[PDB]
Curated annotation (Swiss-Prot), chain B:
The lineage of its organism: Eukaryota, Metazoa, Chordata, Craniata, Vertebrata. ARM repeats lie at residues 1-40, 41-80, 81-122, 129-173, 175-211, 212-251, 254-293, 296-338, 339-385, 386-425. This is Importin subunit alpha-1. The chain holds residues 72 to 497 of 529 of the full protein. Belongs to the importin alpha family. Residues 244-332 are annotated as: NLS binding site (minor). Functions in nuclear protein import as an adapter protein for nuclear receptor KPNB1. Binds specifically and directly to substrates containing either a simple or bipartite NLS motif. Docking of the importin/substrate complex to the nuclear pore complex (NPC) is mediated by KPNB1 through binding to nucleoporin FxFG repeats and the complex is subsequently translocated through the pore by an energy requiring, Ran-dependent mechanism. The gene is Kpna2. Disulfide bonds: none annotated.
Amino acid sequence: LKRKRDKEEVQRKRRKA
Amino acid sequence: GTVNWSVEDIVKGINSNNLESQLQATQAARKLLSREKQPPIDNIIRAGLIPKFVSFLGKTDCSPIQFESAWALTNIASGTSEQTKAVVDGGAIPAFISLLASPHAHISEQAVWALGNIAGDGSAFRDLVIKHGAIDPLLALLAVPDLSTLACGYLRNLTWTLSNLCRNKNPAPPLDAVEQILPTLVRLLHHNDPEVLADSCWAISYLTDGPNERIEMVVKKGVVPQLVKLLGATELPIVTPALRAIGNIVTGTDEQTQKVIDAGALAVFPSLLTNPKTNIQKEATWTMSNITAGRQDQIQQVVNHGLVPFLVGVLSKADFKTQKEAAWAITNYTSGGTVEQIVYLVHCGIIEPLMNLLSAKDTKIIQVILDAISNIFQAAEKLGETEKLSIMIEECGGLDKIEALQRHENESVYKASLNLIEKYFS
């Protein structure tokens, strides 16, 4: 029964400040 | 000097036939694109500057304009998918890959970052970066005897970019790319920098989010002990991906799950199941539900580590989504557990908080709880103590809740409640 699934506020892409 | 130029002035300088004028205009664009508030990405794109910036990536005799244009393009590529696509559409990917070998570390690093933003857009661009050959030169940057000799920021960017090459599904990254990256990734997972550890853990979490064969590729590299060590870290940005990875791994086979148990993961769950961060508690309870879906000896190790009282606690008080995971953990436990394990669950106080959750306006959890109740009744029936459980459920007000479920708007809910009140409460 197994159940599967630098500017801040950023994970996918990062803007360089 | 180059602060707060207009896009029109940038265009004028980039359209000069003067490499130094182009350099100052590219720096001015970089500064616009690096400001904290509302960088004018779309204005820079609409001005037609991406093709020029991409050509500047190739000007080996002017490393400053390579750097400035790499940075400008990195920040364009940090935007929406349309904005990243504009950078890719300009030919940036191969130009950035060629800059990975630049003798100037700041330029190679900027190219690493840019490729991470492109790869981070999603599976297609990730795979396109891979097809253009980015993995070999990226890993060559990390082919050093001791990672500690690399600049901290360089290593963090390399790790974050590699993590994006591991990220996203439909499709997952190419198997050969994963296999090529993994040995370096495991080396980063043992590095002492918290940001490198966090992004390495995220990368591992992405690689283990998938079929059991992808999980196996990772587990075969021996990372589970290190994941369990990181699971006990003080830095939440490390615990979170480490827990996600452990949680993913226990969605796999019983053998993969056993590797997590043998590494000592269960000893960390008293803290994880009481962690003040809701998401940690939820993910930990989700991980527990997948462990209690394992073998009876695995359920037994959950018992031996004293985690059933922690599941009772979560069920008694937690964010509702965590409580829903806990309800699932109990149903899995009671479906796969021995009668002795199931009675132990009752002695730990599961009944009252389980019954209290039947008063929730959520149909999925109701069915899960009714299944658990049935499993416990079947265990009591095997012992002849069915009546004692009935009394307990009635004393805690549970009988009333099941009786009300008879008049629910779901067939399985009504049928389940009716079957219980007829098979055990008649």
